[PDB]
Amino acid sequence: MTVVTTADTSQLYALAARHGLKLHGPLTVNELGLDYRIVIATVDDGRRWVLRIPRRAEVSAKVEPEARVLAMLKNRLPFAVPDWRVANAELVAYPMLEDSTAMVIQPGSSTPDWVVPQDSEVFAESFATALAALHAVPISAAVDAGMLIRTPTQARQKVADDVDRVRREFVVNDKRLHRWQRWLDDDSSWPDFSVVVHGDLYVGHVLIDNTERVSGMIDWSEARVDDPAIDMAAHLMVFGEEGLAKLLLTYEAAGGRVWPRLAHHIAERLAFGAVTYALFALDSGNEEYLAAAKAQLAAAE
Structure with missing residues (x-):
């Protein structure tokens, strides 16, 4: 201004x-x-x-x-x-985009933020379908594009390494830490395959048309081959368990590969978001986002 x-x-x-x-x-x-x-x-x-x-x-x-x-x-x-x-x-x-995102966040107290409704079936179904399409991209194409490729074993080890790093660098609420550790030790939760993931996928990075149908995705800098659940955690965050259950039904029906503990796994991935946030804060150097990360980790869930 x-x-x-x-x-x-x-x-x-x-x-x-x-x-x-x-x-x-x-x-x-x-x-x-x-x-x-x-x-x-x-x-x-x-x-x-x-x-x-x-x-x-x-x-x-x-x-x-x-x-x-x-x-x-x-x-x-x-x-x-x-x-x-x-x-x-x-x-x-x-050129400037004509579509906006499914979540719009603006600075200022008075300026309008916007978030697609929980009850938009057009968004929910088109998002699930689009996500299945992303997760169906062949891993060979990821190799062709020079992408980071993790096996399922590497996917789970990355989470373990990140938890260790956060422990070394931050004060962490005991129950938070124990949650992540139990998750890591729970073989039933973890997938036996990886897929092409967006890596930072939430409504603020999903483009929609004027009918609320997914028209695109943006902010691909964290894309890689890794645990599919990475791309559903924020859907649970914004739309809750019922929103997630619906996503999973449509995703599977569109050909997405699931497993019995997938919904559970996604919830654990969401709780792990506090680790990610903190490490990205630490590496940014930014003092504000760092302060925020410290407070989140210290606090009870």
């Missing part, structure tokens, strides 16, 4: 220009991304574009690997993924 200075504006115009984007009019800058600065601008044809400018070398270095994943996914999925028209260490850019 503040003006972009003349110097910053010139610099941003020049960045776009060296990639063939001729901007015109005022810029809007969103600084709420940890890894990229976001600039919204109008380009030569009157269409607004999003410029995503990597903030650090480690972010720049992932642009090409992530573009390779997106190119694979575009050709293997029946819904949309991000289409990076410029995909450079310096700049990721694309």
Whole structure:
């Protein structure tokens, strides 16, 4: 909501220009991304574009690997993924999306947030169907795209390693810790296969059309081959046990592979989210998100 200075504006115009984007009019800058600065601008044809400018070398270095994943996914999925028209260490850019997400969160107390209704059958069914399609992507295609591949044994070991790391670095509520440990030791819970997963899948990363049907997914930087339950935990979080039960029926009917303790496993994965959050906080360095992580781990569930 503040003006972009003349110097910053010139610099941003020049960045776009060296990639063939001729901007015109005022810029809007969103600084709420940890890894990229976001600039919204109008380009030569009157269409607004999003410029995503990597903030650090480690972010720049992932642009090409992530573009390779997106190119694979575009050709293997029946819904949309991000289409990076410029995909450079310096700049990721694309036309502004016309669809929004199934959860919309805005800064400010008065600004409208939005979340698809619990009782939207169109969303629920299309999400389950889309998720089955993602989990049906051949692992060979993940290999082709340079992705991280975990066997089921590695999947479970990663969880164990993450729990160990959080124990070393944080004070953790005893009952939380014991929950994760019992889960890790419960052979019945764990799948005997892995699949292509999105890895950070919740409603805020699901694009919908004006009928609430899933039209795409975004934020693929954590995608890998791993435990399918990773991609259902946040559905349980937002829509509850009944929402999850419905997801699982539709998912299985659409061809998704399940197992008897899957719903249980998803609940345990959701509880494990506190570990993930804390490790991502620790690695971000961000002081706020870190403080939040510390408080969550210390508190009773």
